[PDB]
Design a protein around this ligand. Sequence first.
Ligand SMILES: COc1ccc(Br)cc1S(=O)(=O)Nc1ccc2c(c1)OC(C)(C)C(=O)N2
Length: 134
Amino acid sequence: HHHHHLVPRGSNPPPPETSNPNKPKRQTNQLQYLLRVVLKTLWKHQFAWPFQQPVDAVKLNLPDYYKIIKTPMDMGTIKKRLENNYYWNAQECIQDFNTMFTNCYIYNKPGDDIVLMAEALEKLFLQKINELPT
Ligand SMILES: COc1ccc(Br)cc1S(=O)(=O)Nc1ccc2c(c1)OC(C)(C)C(=O)N2
C-alpha cells in the first residue's frame, strides 16, 4: 500500500566508448581532415550545442529518448574519438556522424527547431565531405 514507486529513478545510459586498447586504429589523411576540417567547422557553429555531448535525457526531460534511440551518438564523442585516434578509417567516423543526424531525424518531427539545426549542420557536413582528400 505505502510503496508509491517514487524510486528507483531513471538515468542516462553509459555514454559511447572513446577508448578501446584492443580496437584496431590508424591515422590517415582522411581522418586528420575529419578532425581539422569537418569536426572543427561543425563544433564552432551556433547550432552545434545540442550535439556537443551525449544526450542528457534527465536534464532535458526527454524520458523517451533512450527508449527510441538505441545507438546514441554525438559530436563530443566523435571529437574525443578523433583526438584519441580511435578510428581505423574515415568510414567509421563518417558513420558516427550519420548516426547522430539520423537519430535526430528519428526522434523529432520535420520542422522542429532541433531538426532545422541538424539539417543545417548536415548540409555543412556534406559540403566538407565532398572535399575529402581522395
Ligand atoms: C524545449 O527544448 C528545446 C527546444 C529547442 C531546442 Br533547439 C532545444 C531544446 S532543449 O535542448 O532544451 N531540449 C531538447 C529537446 C529535444 C531534442 C534536443 C534537445 O536535442 C536532441 C539532440 C536530444 C534531440 O534530438 N532533440
